[PDB]
Design a protein around this nucleic acid. Structure first.
Length: 88
DNA sequence: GGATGTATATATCTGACACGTGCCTGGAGACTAGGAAGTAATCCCCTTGGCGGTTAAAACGCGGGGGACAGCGCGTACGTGCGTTTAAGCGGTTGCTAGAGCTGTCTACGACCAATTGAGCGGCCTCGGCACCGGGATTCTCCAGGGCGGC
């Protein structure tokens, strides 16, 4: 069975355990339990669906198919998470 | 006697200054209308310092036990290091399409103004329901007569 699905669904596993460890090191965490990574993947996914849903709404209002950075800045500012350095 | 360390001179690289040009956006000048400042009147709320009385909350003290904290043991789960795999990162192909920018035309849609009128705000009268007063029906406590016993 060489053939398989073209699309990939485990892209939340692409946020690897060393990446989450580096994020915790930047946050100042010395010791990390083994169940941290699944919870971090879940909260990152929830945050990303919120921001991406608002940015897709901003894109669809402008009758566009691409998602610009300015829509992402709008979506983050609407959630009280203003980001500097991408225009505006 | 030969080659090495070091000083001064010359060519080249690179950020910065000034020159040039477009253009379009801000500034100068004039006019006008209305937004806001000022005025007077009326009425209601807030301020400061008091008094009186109720009463429930606040304060104080005390006993006791529940919970916070410290110490110790233990076992497991995470850190650390190394070898191996793997996929990210970069550079690249190849076409098509989405989108920004610019120009051009036009048309439907919204601003604007005048006349109108009907939906919103206040009061007035009435009804639904709750309550106060008068009258009829039902049940409970009581005073007196009859009969029996004693000296």
């Amino acid at each position: 069975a060489k053939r398989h699905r073209k699309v990939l669904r485990d892209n939340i596993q692409g946020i690897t355990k060393p990446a989450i460890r580096r994020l915790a090191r930047r946050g100042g965490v010395k010791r990390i339990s083994g169940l941290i990574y699944e919870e971090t993947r879940g909260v990152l996914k929830v945050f990303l669906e919120n921001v991406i849903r608002d940015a897709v709404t901003y894109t669809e209002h402008a009758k566009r198919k691409t998602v610009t950075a300015m829509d992402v800045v709008y979506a983050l500012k609407r959630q009280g998470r203003t980001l500097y350095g991408f225009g505006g």
